[PDB]
């Protein structure tokens, strides 16, 4: 699969991946900066801790940086 990957936020080949994801969570700067954002690819939709948001998708470049 092809996915956007942080920190570069470029489209990269993940030949062994099947999903792209967008992961968001509050670090201790959340009040000043909003949520942290991680973009990656995985073999399967990653499992995450309760206060972490993850959205998985299965099309090339389906996880662009969430600007809107």
């Amino acid at each position, epitope marked *: 699969i092809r996915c956007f990957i942080t920190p570069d936020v470029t489209s990269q080949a993940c030949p062994d991946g099947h999903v792209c994801y967008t992961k968001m969570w509050c670090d*201790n700067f959340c009040g000043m900066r909003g949520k942290r954002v991680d973009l990656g690819c995985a073999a399967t939709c990653p499992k995450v801790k309760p206060g972490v948001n993850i959205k998985c998708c299965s099309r090339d470049n389906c996880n662009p940086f*969430p600007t809107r």
Partner: antibody
Framework: EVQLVESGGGFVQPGGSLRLSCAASGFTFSNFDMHWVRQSPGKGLEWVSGLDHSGGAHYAGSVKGRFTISREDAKNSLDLQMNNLRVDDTAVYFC????????????????????WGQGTLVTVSS | EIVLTQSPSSLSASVGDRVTITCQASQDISNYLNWYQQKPGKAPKLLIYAASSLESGVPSRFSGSGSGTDFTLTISSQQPEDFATYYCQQANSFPYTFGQGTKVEIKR
């Protein structure tokens, strides 16, 4: 596998020069702020110099006029030209990556030093 | 420059002890405060950024707290792996400055 590998360490008389180099692998080097941090038993950890992803250089007052930081993005290398060396420059020098954290509000650099090289010894003595 | 002073400079702990290390800044640095761990002959390792945010893989016994001029690193259950020197570091303003280090030694 993210790596910083230092070279160019050595020893000189006071007033001598050395050039440290750091080879970066496993990340897009040009995207990151890069720094040099030194350590001696008597100075603890001391930030020396930083060269931001925008080409902006910063220096500790202790090295101003004597040290020059540079990078060659095409060669994934960061250098520290050390001139007019003083005995109190004797230290282990670490090549260090500044953090690059993404938030909904944008891109933040050098909050912390997340990747450190093994360090290379510089000795200045008569 | 901003001066960070850690207390104590060294302490002795048993395995499973609660260890607390403080870092005091010469001026307000909001939460621009990191903690590093360093063992002899090794580079420092980043454990905590933004005063309280753990890096990936850092075990839950590590926590950070504070803001402004006063910060605390707590190791709630000291492990053999945790005997090391700890440094705070401010990223509020140039130059970046570190505390003097706190060495955690094994009590026997």
């Amino acid at each position: 596998e993210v790596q910083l590998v230092e070279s160019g360490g050595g020893f000189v008389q006071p007033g001598g020069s050395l050039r440290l180099s750091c080879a970066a692998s496993g990340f897009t080097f040009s995207n990151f702020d890069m720094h040099w941090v030194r350590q001696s038993p008597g100075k603890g950890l001391e930030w020396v110099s930083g060269l931001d992803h925008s080409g902006g250089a910063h220096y500790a007052g202790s090295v101003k006029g004597r040290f020059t930081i540079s990078r060659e993005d095409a060669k994934n290398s960061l250098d520290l030209q050390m001139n007019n060396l003083r005995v109190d420059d004797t230290a282990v020098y670490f090549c260090v990556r500044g953090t690059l954290y993404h938030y909904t509000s944008g891109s933040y650099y050098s909050d912390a030093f997340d990747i450190w090289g093994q360090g290379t010894l510089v000795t200045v003595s008569s | 420059e901003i001066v960070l002073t850690q207390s104590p400079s060294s302490l002795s702990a048993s395995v499973g002890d609660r260890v607390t290390i403080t870092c005091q800044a010469s001026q307000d640095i909001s939460n621009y405060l990191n903690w590093y761990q360093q063992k002899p002959g090794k580079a420092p390792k980043l454990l905590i950024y933004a005063a309280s945010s753990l890096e990936s893989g850092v075990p839950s016994r590590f926590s950070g707290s504070g803001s402004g001029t006063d910060f605390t690193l707590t190791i709630s259950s000291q492990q053999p792996e945790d005997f090391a020197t700890y440094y705070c570091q401010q990223a509020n303003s140039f130059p970046y400055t570190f505390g003097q280090g706190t060495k955690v030694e094994i009590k026997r």
